[PDB]
Amino acid sequence: EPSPYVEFDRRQWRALRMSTPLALTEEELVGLRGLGEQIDLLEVEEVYLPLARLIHLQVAARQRLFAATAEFLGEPQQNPDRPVPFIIGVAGSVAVGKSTTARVLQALLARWDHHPRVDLVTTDGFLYPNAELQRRNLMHRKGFPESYNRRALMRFVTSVKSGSDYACAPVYSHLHYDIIPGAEQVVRHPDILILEGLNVLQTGPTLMVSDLFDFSLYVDARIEDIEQWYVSRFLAMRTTAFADPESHFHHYAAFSDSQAVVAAREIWRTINRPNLVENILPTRPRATLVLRKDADHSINRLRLRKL
Amino acid sequence: EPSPYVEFDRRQWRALRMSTPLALTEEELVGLRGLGEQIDLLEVEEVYLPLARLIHLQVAARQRLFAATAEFLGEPQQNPDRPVPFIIGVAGSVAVGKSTTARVLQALLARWDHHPRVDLVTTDGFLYPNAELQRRNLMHRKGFPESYNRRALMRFVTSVKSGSDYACAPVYSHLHYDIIPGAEQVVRHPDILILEGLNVLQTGPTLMVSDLFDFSLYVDARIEDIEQWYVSRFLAMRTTAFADPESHFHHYAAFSDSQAVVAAREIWRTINRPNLVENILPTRPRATLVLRKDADHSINRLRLRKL
Numbered sequence: 001e002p003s004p005y006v007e008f009d010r011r012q013w014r015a016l017r018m019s020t021p022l023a024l025t026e027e028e029l030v031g032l033r034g035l036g037e038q039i040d041l042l043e044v045e046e047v048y049l050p051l052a053r054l055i056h057l058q059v060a061a062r063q064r065l066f067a068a069t070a071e072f073l074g075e076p077q078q079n080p081d082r083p084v085p086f087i088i089g090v091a092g093s094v095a096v097g098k099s100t101t102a103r104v105l106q107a108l109l110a111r112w113d114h115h116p117r118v119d120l121v122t123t124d125g126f127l128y129p130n131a132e133l134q135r136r137n138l139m140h141r142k143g144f145p146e147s148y149n150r151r152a153l154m155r156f157v158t159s160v161k162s163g164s165d166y167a168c169a170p171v172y173s174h175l176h177y178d179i180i181p182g183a184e185q186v187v188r189h190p191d192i193l194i195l196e197g198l199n200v201l202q203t204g205p206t207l208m209v210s211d212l213f214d215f216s217l218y219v220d221a222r223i224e225d226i227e228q229w230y231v232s233r234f235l236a237m238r239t240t241a242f243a244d245p246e247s248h249f250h251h252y253a254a255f256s257d258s259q260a261v262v263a264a265r266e267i268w269r270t271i272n273r274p275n276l277v278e279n280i281l282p283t284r285p286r287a288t289l290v291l292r293k294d295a296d297h298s299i300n301r302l303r304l305r306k307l
Numbered sequence: 308e309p310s311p312y313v314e315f316d317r318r319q320w321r322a323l324r325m326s327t328p329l330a331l332t333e334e335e336l337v338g339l340r341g342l343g344e345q346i347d348l349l350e351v352e353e354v355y356l357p358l359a360r361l362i363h364l365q366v367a368a369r370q371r372l373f374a375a376t377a378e379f380l381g382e383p384q385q386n387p388d389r390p391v392p393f394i395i396g397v398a399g400s401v402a403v404g405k406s407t408t409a410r411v412l413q414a415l416l417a418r419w420d421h422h423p424r425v426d427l428v429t430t431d432g433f434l435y436p437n438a439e440l441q442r443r444n445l446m447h448r449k450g451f452p453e454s455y456n457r458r459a460l461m462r463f464v465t466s467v468k469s470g471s472d473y474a475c476a477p478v479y480s481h482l483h484y485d486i487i488p489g490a491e492q493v494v495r496h497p498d499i500l501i502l503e504g505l506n507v508l509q510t511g512p513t514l515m516v517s518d519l520f521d522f523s524l525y526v527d528a529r530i531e532d533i534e535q536w537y538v539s540r541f542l543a544m545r546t547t548a549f550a551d552p553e554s555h556f557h558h559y560a561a562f563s564d565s566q567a568v569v570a571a572r573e574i575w576r577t578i579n580r581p582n583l584v585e586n587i588l589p590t591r592p593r594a595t596l597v598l599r600k601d602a603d604h605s606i607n608r609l610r611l612r613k614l
């Protein structure tokens with residue numbers, strides 16, 4: 001039974017670190033992890049370092065591929081100070097830790113030798129404004145494929161990967177739970193662009209950003225564990241983000257553990273689980289590398305696409 | 308407005324032939340074209356030669372990419388007499404000429420310098436036997452995604468691309484309109500494998516053969532023209548394939564131009580058009596190179612994916 005994938009346990013995967021240096025301190029790591037995340041420097045060494053190696057081995061090889069098409073076309077040469085940007089997709093369910101995984105990865109690749117311009121963009125900013133969502137009757141579908149301005153998103157990544165000087169992306173506010181009027185994240189010809197979002201690995205009747213990814217990550221975990229992380233993180237936010245009177249969810253701060261648990265579960269039941277099951281998980285088979293986490297948040301199993 | 312594609316008219320595309328030699332005679336070409344096809348040596352020079360170049364430029368570059376992952380993994384070296392097979396997908400509607408396009412391409416790549424083992428496989432053989440189709444009530448859905456043993460198909464391509472020594476594929480009979488009992492096409496570690504079929508470019512909830520393609524072709528034409536080619540070819544077959552008393556469609560041989568036209572159109576209307584519109588055409592955006600044909604069958608426009 002041949003397979004396009006090859007599996008690894010942490011032991012087998014850490015050995016592939018070779019002599020990749022760790023350019024991240026305990027403090028720096030901290031300002032990168034999210035509430036609830038258990039990621040430590042050891043996990044960054046045994047897991048994120050090999051990955052950082054594999055990515056660098058493929059950034060060069062991926063360039064030969066575009067070089068070929070350039071040659072074929074009898075095109076210039078591609079200023080070495082402006083090669084074709086390596087796009088990386090990071091996917092997974094809400095609360096599975098993917099935003100941390102992305103932030104940490106950007107940190108490791110930025111500290112690679114020639115100091116690459118490694119930008120990071122969350123699909124958060126490509127969600128339709130609340131007003132527009134209400135219009136489409138989608139206010140209770142945030143995160144589902146249809147609640148994002150997919151065309152704009154694709155326009156953005158195509159722009160960057162096609163060598164444009166700069167490209168803009170809207171910015172989403174978690175505090176206000178809506179797109180921020182007039183706010184934009186400018187990305188200027190990075191060497192690497194990481195795109196993090198729920199369905200970035202999705203495929204369809206049109207060319208999508210998944211078709212432009214040169215490498216993709218899917219952070220995974222048993223669904224039940226993710227719900228616990230979700231609920232738990234919800235309760236913890238009563239004294240962090242919800243505490244802020246400006247917060248759209250401020251009314252949640254005064255909930256009892258019990259009341260809050262009921263609320264979190266309902267949201268999970270009606271929005272996040274469905275989206276995970278119907279849209280996110282079906283895209284897992286296509287990811288270059290899947291990071292599997294045990295109930296403790298620890299990455300103890302990995303699946304790589306060798307084909 | 309940046310784009311992942313770059314378009315060409317025949318004039319611009321022929322210039323990319325450079326000094327690629329034509330190793331195909333008038334006779335040889337003939338035994339490769341299908342009834343109704345208007346392909347001549349000129350079209351092979353101005354269109355198939357550049358393509359043969361682009362493919363060879365990418366076969367090398369595509370190998371660097373697998374080489375990287377091999378290095379990363381600290382794997383052997385890959386016997387140069389056994390590198391990772393370059394898979395090519397050729398898609399398009401029934402009667403658009405794709406089978407010819409595939410056969411011609413195999414001919415050109417086989418006559419490349421080091422004489423590569425270039426195998427060709429049609430998804431014909433992965434259709435469920437008529438008995439099995441009747442069971443699933445699919446006898447009038449031949450060609451639709453669900454009428455193929457998709458799992459077996461994927462098993463086959465995965466086997467070949469993963470370096471297996473040999474892999475078997477069932478053989479379909481057009482004469483009998485069913486799978487041939489006990490017949491098999493053996494493919495032994497080719498250097499290049501071309502897969503031709505209606506929906507080979509299809510994508511889904513599982514890893515599919517489109518995910519294993521290193522390069523893909525989509526033969527295209529206005530839908531109305533394809534119907535005319537289809538109908539026309541149907542009538543012409545009254546004196547070729549349908550003439551054979553063994554032919555499952557022998558009853559069609561005695562049809563009048565009028566009767567046959569009515570029959571062809573009904574089949575097109577109920578089976579081939581729907582499948583083209585619902586399943587085949589939505590996969591066009593993902594093809595590396597689209598070959599567009601005018602009402603005369605002539606390829607006068609091409610769209611390449613540079614991203």
Ligand SMILES: CC(C)(CO)[C@@H](O)C(=O)NCCC(=O)O
Binds near residue numbers: 124141
């Ligand atoms: C997890 C995100 C950030 C998805 O964008 C969050 O906006 C979400 O899933 N909201 C669902 C609707 C709600 O929170 O009531």
Ligand SMILES: CC(C)(CO)[C@@H](O)C(=O)NCCC(=O)O
Binds near residue numbers: 431446447450578
């Ligand atoms: C074009 C093919 C070869 C598709 O496999 C042919 O088997 C087909 O589309 N048949 C449809 C059913 C029929 O011909 O009545």
